[PDB]
Subunit: 244 residues, 4 copies
């Protein structure tokens, strides 16, 4: 039974991921920041399924919280096999009106946070000479998007970072890959607001917004599949056709 | 039970693919060109497993053979759900000594053949408003490789072609993706010869050549997964770190 | 004074390229297939400018014509410094209605022709331990386009091919790069017809179709610049924002 | 005469860029952080050439300094036509031993600094409905590199950011492109130390390290060429063959 750490597992994509790895019987550390109750329900579901779960409230943009989150999984089970860096937020605004704080917040969490988590997981994984790290980026990091210079910067940064992380870990058998989802129905997407959501829908060749379960399916393949042990330093896009 | 057509399924990657989709209980048309006996054994294995199989000898670079191959699956089962365009060959030589026939043969099979197969599958899939097409390319189509201008051209061509194929089929719900494998141990690779095979091995970050089963695993995800229904027009690389 | 061979130099982009390299004083072989008169006028203009020019009617999809075209420049001047593989055509149609002849014609010229020309130039360039080859592809080879599976395949193929060509020539100091233009106003584009041309115009972030001179400017940099001697195996896109 | 602002113009690439745009007669704001004397000499050279120059000491990772740097060019000449975001540093170390301060410093300058500069230039350029922004990234942002997770993250981030910047500015006719150099002989590269520099040299197909003038040549094309007005949201690589 693999030990999986999923950041931002209380809602949306991270939650679908957590439930799916639980249903496959993994030991899952469900991290949350503010949604304690929602994480607990996730833990309970994983359990009803036969997986094992421990909830952990911590801000992944803070080193202390990150070192603590890893410690909790290691104290509970003996190691960490997989880490899915999913936590993220948006602070949308045209480049011309963007406040430095809007830039910093997105960068601190979405980019630096992924660095902290990856670094922490890696030190543990090096010793065991095995592990998998999956970072959730976005198609926006690839093809940009109006009103999202901050988010685009952070997501693109996750990709360049994951590639070096892949190179450094190759020696100790640690796979590092990135998943780039397109428009997925979640709370993050509910914020851009309906008339806009519809607008985006005519932009998607497959004419359908993706579901959190769609991403989880792909993450599950990368995390558990024996085949995926030969995949590193790559970005995998599930976007229904946007970034063709 | 999905009906899957796999070209070049008598040996290497196509065979691993055929066996794996059979073990999952699909109805598999195992195509072969010259290895009749080896295809039959594949058919038998699929059967021992509980999948269904029909062997079909045909050259996929010929329209007639292609239209015939599709007909045989349609006469047998009622439709085709998935087509995996795997058949391919190499005719290596420096650009400076390359004969037009060495260029043509690689192009006719590896590129035009994929066009023929995709076109044929698509006409059938459009009517049913559903289907998945997976084309096997190569990392060489992405980053080139000395002694393989012909193969690089054809493989890169498969990618551009698959992207348009993805756009045209999006409307009728047909997913088209490409898989780009790195060095995989097979008969194709056995031909470059040992001292060379070793040389290539120090070029692979994960320090391991891939196995046909590694590719099959990924193809199986793309062919069968509900998650993969949201993936189109993308190239997926399994190369142990070469093309990072 | 560099000797430059430009294929398809009688009209559109190839012509703008020919005129611009002539105005910079190069010796230019202006190739044409059917537009003899238009090539002659190009030759005359180059001359009025102070460059030197020789017209050559030949089909670049034929080996004989290609070997002949190279011979003519070599007999005239002592060598070839730059080759710009520009000749190309389109045979648009949905994948579902595409005749094999429509596929073949686009592939024979746009892909194989580039192989023939590059191969011929390379054998000459290897001996001199210097040279530059610039292949004109298209943004379509990168992001696909409905109604152009053939063209997309050929253009993408040009890219993979150019990358291997770059690797093989690196040793003898031969640079090989690709230029990918977006929508450029020319006879090729006049064929898609007005209501369509307007439609495409709202797709271009810079809201302007490109001009043949725009491409020539970039080709001139790659062909003549001392800086461009450090650039190989790359694709350069001038598309006013389509493929961001 | 275009007004060009070049960040980090006292040494290496930024300096070659400054000299070259000066020799073409632009008005150049040469920014520096600590090398006041070296910037002055650059200013003098530009002048001996017939260009115009004003030196400006400021840290481009600070908003105040950035707003001040723009003000100085605007007070001097009436506007800004081109901004080249060149300033950058490295803080190399394996991911496993990387201090948060080593991460932050590289991110603050190389990524956030580019945001500050681009934002400032853009507000000015929007009003004039014209301008060009060229951000210097690195091939490392594309293909990663051991010991440089921080730098790779920042450089990749510059690319995603530049793409959104391109989209937002398209409307007001502002071009935004990125240049990705490979190994260039400069003080930045002198720091990795000789036995390493030699090692890297056998990795370069063209078997030559690039020169600051090579990058300047390409930047000059993008900054001044009428042709480059049709180029946006793209990354241009000069790396002698590394990232093929
Ligand atoms: N939705 C899309 O269309 C789309 C497209 C591409 C990529 N993505 C990416 O997918 C990931 C999740 O997508 P989403 O749509 O699922 O968003 P969401 O519904 O808003 O969920 C974000 C999650 O992040 C957690 N979180 C926020 N700040 C955190 C912090 N400082 N530390 C630790 N956890 C934190 C939240 O937990 P609490 O509520 O408990 O605080 C929450 O579970 C993000 O990386 C997002 O960028 C989404
Ligand atoms: N091996 C690698 O490292 C690698 C890396 C990247 C991509 N790939 C690709 O993977 C696919 C298969 O790999 P491989 O290594 O499996 O090669 P392989 O062991 O040589 O098998 C090639 C297969 O193609 C079939 N075939 C050949 N010509 C055909 C034709 N004209 N029509 C129909 N079927 C034909 C052969 O069947 P018969 O013997 O019955 O004639 C055989 O089953 C190819 O597309 C290859 O390019 C391989
Ligand atoms: N126009 C665009 O928007 C666009 C976008 C991307 C790429 N491109 C590419 O740019 C190149 C030229 O563009 P274009 O728009 O300039 O097209 P064009 O105006 O139709 O000109 C094509 C040229 O090719 C020559 N040619 C045709 N067949 C030939 C053959 N078999 N052998 C030798 N020369 C031949 C023609 O010469 P003759 O008339 O004398 O026969 C003509 O000068 C092509 O590779 C095209 O794919 C164009
Ligand atoms: N060298 C390469 O191989 C290579 C490869 C790819 C990309 N690049 C990029 O090229 C750019 C320059 O390359 P380089 O090799 O030229 O480096 P360099 O020789 O070390 O020069 C860096 C420059 O940045 C300036 N600078 C440093 N910190 C600054 C700050 N906070 N604010 C404003 N200016 C600052 C320095 O000025 P002062 O000394 O006056 O403080 C100096 O002129 C960087 O973005 C680097 O990443 C270089």
């Amino acid at each position: 039974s693999p030990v999986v750490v999923v950041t931002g597992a209380s809602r949306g994509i991270g939650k679908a991921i957590a439930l799916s790895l639980g249903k496959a019987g993994c030991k899952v550390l469900v991290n949350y920041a503010r949604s304690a109750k929602a994480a607990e329900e996730v833990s309970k579901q994983i359990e009803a399924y036969g997986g094992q779960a421990i909830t952990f409230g911590g801000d992944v943009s803070k080193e202390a919280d990150v070192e603590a989150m890893m410690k909790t999984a290691i104290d509970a089970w003996g190691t960490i096999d997989v880490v899915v860096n999913n936590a993220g937020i948006t602070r949308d605004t045209l480049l011309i009106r963007m406040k430095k704080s809007q830039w910093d917040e997105v960068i601190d969490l979405n980019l630096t946070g992924v660095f902290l988590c990856t670094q922490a997981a890696t030190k543990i994984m090096m010793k065991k000479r095995k592990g998998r790290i999956i970072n959730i980026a976005s198609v926006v990091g690839l093809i940009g998007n109006i009103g999202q210079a901050n988010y685009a910067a952070a997501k693109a940064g996750v990709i360049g970072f994951s590639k070096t992380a892949a190179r450094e870990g190759a020696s100790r058998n640690i796979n590092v890959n990135v998943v780039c989802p397109g428009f997925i129905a979640s709370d993050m997407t509910a914020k851009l607001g309906e008339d806009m959501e519809k607008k985006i829908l005519g932009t998607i060749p497959l004419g359908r917004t993706g579901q959190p379960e769609n991403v989880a399916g792909l993450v599950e393949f990368l995390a558990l599949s024996p085949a995926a042990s030969y995949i590193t330093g790559q970005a995998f896009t599930i976007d229904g056709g946007i970034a063709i």
